[PDB]
Amino acid sequence: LHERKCEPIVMTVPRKSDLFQDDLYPDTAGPEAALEAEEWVSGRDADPILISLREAYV
Amino acid sequence: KVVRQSKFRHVFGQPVKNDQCYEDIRVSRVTWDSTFCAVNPKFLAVIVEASGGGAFLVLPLSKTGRIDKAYPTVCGHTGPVLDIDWCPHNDEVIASGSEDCTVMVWQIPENGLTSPLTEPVVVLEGHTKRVGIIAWHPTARNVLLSAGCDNVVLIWNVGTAEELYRLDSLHPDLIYNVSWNHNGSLFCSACKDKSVRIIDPRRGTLVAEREKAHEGARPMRAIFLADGKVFTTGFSRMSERQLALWDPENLEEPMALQELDSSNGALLPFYDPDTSVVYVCGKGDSSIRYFEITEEPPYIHFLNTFTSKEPQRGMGSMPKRGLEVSKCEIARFYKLHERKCEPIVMTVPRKSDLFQDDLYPDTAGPEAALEAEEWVSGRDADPILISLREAYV
Amino acid sequence: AALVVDNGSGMCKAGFAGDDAPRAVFPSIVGRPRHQGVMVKDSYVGDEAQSKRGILTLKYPIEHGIVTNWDDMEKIWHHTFYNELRVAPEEHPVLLTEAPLNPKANREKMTQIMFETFNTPAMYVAIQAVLSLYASGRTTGIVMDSGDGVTHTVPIYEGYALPHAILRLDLAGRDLTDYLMKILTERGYSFTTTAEREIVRDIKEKLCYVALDFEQEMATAASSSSLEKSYELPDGQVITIGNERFRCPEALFQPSFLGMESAGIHETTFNSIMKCDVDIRKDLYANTVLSGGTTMYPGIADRMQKEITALAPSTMKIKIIAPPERKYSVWIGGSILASLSTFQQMWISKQEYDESGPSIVHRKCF
Ligand SMILES: Nc1ncnc2c1ncn2[C@@H]1O[C@H](COP(=O)(O)OP(=O)(O)O)[C@@H](O)[C@H]1O
Ligand SMILES: [Mg+2]
Fold first, then answer.
1. Cβ contacts of A19 on chain B, cutoff 8 Å
2. Which residue of chain B is at minimal alpha-carbon distance from A19?
3. (Microbial infection) Isoglutamyl lysine isopeptide (Lys-Glu) (interchain with E-270) crosslink: positions (chain C)?
4. Residue C136: which H helix or E strand, with range?
5. A17 to chain B, closest Cα gap in Å
6. Minimum Cα–Cα distance from B150: chain A residue
7. Nearest CB to B264; choose among C78, C105, C116
8. What's the rounded Cα separation, in Å, for the pair B269 and B291?
9. B104 near B124, Cβ under 8 Å?
10. Which of B148, B245, B279, C343 could form a disulfide with B131, with the two C-beta atoms 3.0–4.6 Å apart?
């Protein structure tokens, strides 16, 4: 963020191969909630739901 | 009894005249140790340096002399080209592997190139890394072997653009070179682990393996012989270049082991099944050494050596079909300098000017013995032999 | 045990990081026999070629800072690691040196050979001019690097280089050796073969010097024999040279002696500093550092200072820095830099290159 401009910056890992990189992209937390608010008040603890980024490869 | 019986003990090398060479060629500057040249009795193909992507220059043999810098080239790869190979059953077909992890097969026009060639006949995408090893099947038609840096060996049917076989869990390290056997049933491979492997592709099984064939860490080669043996050129613990002969039925010790020198540079062997003579050239070397392989011990007899004052960058060998039989020529070698390709004639001295039947036994013809589908079934056939008597003038 | 390798056009310097002097200093020449043997090795590299140069044709793999043939270039590196240092390249990180404004293609070939042919674990390549300032222990200055292949002037201010102000002069020691060869003909001495070239080079490194006033020196040599010096040829013959002692180095300041339209080193230094910003020219004037074997002519610094002072404004303080060890300033700076604790992160791993390629080499390098 500048004073009058929004500039995206891109960090990339230099890789010779153009295929999908399994190691670079492990399972990532998805947009699906693991547990609900009422369950949290009880004391339930769960890890974020993990998804795969392989399908995003073009 | 005093002299070992041979017909090639006095074979001498002679470079062609200046006008018969090819100059003004920007040879490729890739550190990959390959032949850098593929020649068939019609055309000459040499890997060249391109600013963008990779390309190799293909020119007719008659087009000698200086070459235009704007001469059209086969520029289809997006990365530098690693190796090239002409199709034995089609002199107008050449396969190329490059750093773009792909293999593209080209069809050259009869008269040569008038415009730069970019689109290939068939593209093969089966390797995750750069492909520096390509080998046409000696007998089966439209069958190509590719081995990339991913330690994966693939068999392709260029006619159908189909990957016939996949060999992955067979090479723990980088593969140096791969050579088919006589009938095309088996292929030998040289790997960075100093292990020589004989593998049946149609079955995907390791037939024989010799670990630590050469103790040196430098790159080493391995080729099949017509009779069915393996010739490996490698390095010793003291970094001395060695030549070894191996029996596939007994690999506990090599049949022969001779040391040439302590010079660097990988030794590229060139085998002539008709004469049973292997020509050993080293990258950056100014001399070519040729040896005769016979059943008499020590099974490796040094014949002679042609010596030059210039190191070569690569090497291409003319098959028997394109040689001048009338001049008692048994081999032609296209020495590649940094900016020039100098053909070298390997000549057997003979008083008689007539045809020499002994020097020229029947050689494999340009017609495939089998087809890809037939070979897949497991059919095995020797290459069809033709007669070189007709080439006499 | 990091290895510091400084490969020049004619000289190659190698050693271990932390040392105060290169362990291996041998000529960068490849010799091949030009005759036929009659008593029952096709190439010689380095001192062995020099010891057998009588029957060999000497060739320089590097010409004008350009690799004319990489096949002999690999031989130089192979001779360095195994025959000079007697070490395994795969076991030691190697620090490399590049000429200023080095082409990316040249660096890529240097990088590819190191990781593939020799399988070095880690390596890095640094600018020769920058390394020279490290040996001088300075952060701001202009270094003129005149070696065997080409002369370069690289100004550096507060650790920042100015590529636009970098100047190149295609005139170095090899051209002087050729110039000494041609001018020796007038005295009756003939030298034509490549073997004789090294002999002439030895005379140049031993009897040549820079005169403060060329015209006055010419008058002195034409009216006295005090400037005569005698050199003994390997065959026992002795030759005497007079004005040629200071005439050959004079080509540095008067390139027209070689027919070159370009100007001398003193001006080439002056244009380079004149090209940068006005606010940093003050530091560069007093921080002129001389590097390269071609700067060992006695009195060159005094002639250097006088010439630039005439070009530079009178108010300006001119200081010429000529350390006695500036012949190995590139190597000495490399050993110093490689010994630094903060240098460990500049290293490039072999595995990293195998997966990323030379792209990571163009970055992290200047
Ligand atoms: N004492 C000396 N006097 C004059 N010139 C010298 C002397 N020593 C070396 N040289 C010259 O320096 C050149 C090489 O210097 P240097 O820069 O150290 O190596 P390179 O140029 O190969 O990197 C040689 O061509 C040589 O002629
Ligand atoms: Mg130098």
1. 128
2. B128
3. 41
4. helix C128-136
5. 7
6. A17
7. C78
8. 10
9. yes
10. B148
